[model samples]
Target: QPKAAPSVTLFPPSSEELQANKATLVCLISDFYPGAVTVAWKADSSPVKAGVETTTPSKQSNNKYAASSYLSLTPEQWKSHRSYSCQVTHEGSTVEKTVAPTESSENLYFQ
Candidate 1:
């Protein structure tokens, strides 16, 4: 059986979100087969654990699997970090999506 690797996309929270008590960083892992993946978060290249969450992979209309991982942070904490990253591992293969702080949370990508 052939294994499909997932495409990782990291998204930063919007300005409105920053005004709130906690901002969220999103990691979207999509278009993979078998629906088995491990998601992790990083701050400035350091591993993160607290305030992190992930969902079980769901089958898409196109028959591929997709999942989301979230990292919650305070506005002050988000501003203090240099970079945030989402790492997705599927079938022994890994992908990294590191994104700097930015606005516009309505971005999505597919292939």
Candidate 2:
């Protein structure tokens, strides 16, 4: 029997917590079958020039694939409110998830 297909997801950081500097962009892709997946990051609807990192997937007890990628940007870039996206390609299917920085972070602050 063949394995099931995988899905892609993009998690965004809170706005208030989103400092102009020292913030990293992360993209996580998981629940993939056959272990064939590619992840990439795009900035402003275009590919980033550099400072992108991707991790290899480790096998889970359920026999599924999972991986993550991160992009580090300068303070100016994050403050510019540029659009970022995580793209996943698998089994001849391509999916893209995007997120924009917003101004909401009540949950991120600690008393």
Candidate 3:
């Protein structure tokens, strides 16, 4: 039998620059072998306050799973340059990715 492939994708709410309190962060994970997948959010290596909106794998399609999280904060929080991480756990392997608001292409405005 051939080995299964792993795939992942992350999508932002807006194509334009993201603004504080206006941008929505979305992370999607897909294509995994049969097993339980764990997703989490962390800030500066420590866990931060975030809301996991959804986590459902595509049944009609192949072995594909996706999860999403949202964070609504003031411009200050977005500019704080806090590091956010998305972790996915399956079997004994764990794959994770980290992103900072400032690092994003989104613009910030404070008026």
For all candidates in order, the CA lDDT equals 0.72, 0.65, 0.52
RMSD of each: 7.0, 4.1, 4.9
* Leading candidate by TM-score: 1
Q: What is residue 44's positional error in candidate 1, in angstroms?
A: 3.0
For residues 41-82, write the lDDT of model 3, one tens digit per residue.
Answer: 556476766655555444325434444445554344443645
Which candidate would rank higher by lDDT, 1 or 3?
1
- Scanning candidate 1 in windows of ten residues, the lowest lDDT window is 94-103
lDDT of 2 at 66: 72
lDDT of 2: 0.65
TM-score of 3: 0.58
- The worst-scoring run of ten residues by lDDT in candidate 3 lies at 1-10
Better of 1 and 2 by TM-score: 1
Clashes of 1: 0
Residue range 1-111, candidate 2, lDDT tens digits: 355666556565545445534567777666765566666767757777557666567877776767777777764566575677766667777666556665467655557
Ten contiguous residues minimizing lDDT sum, candidate 2: 12-21
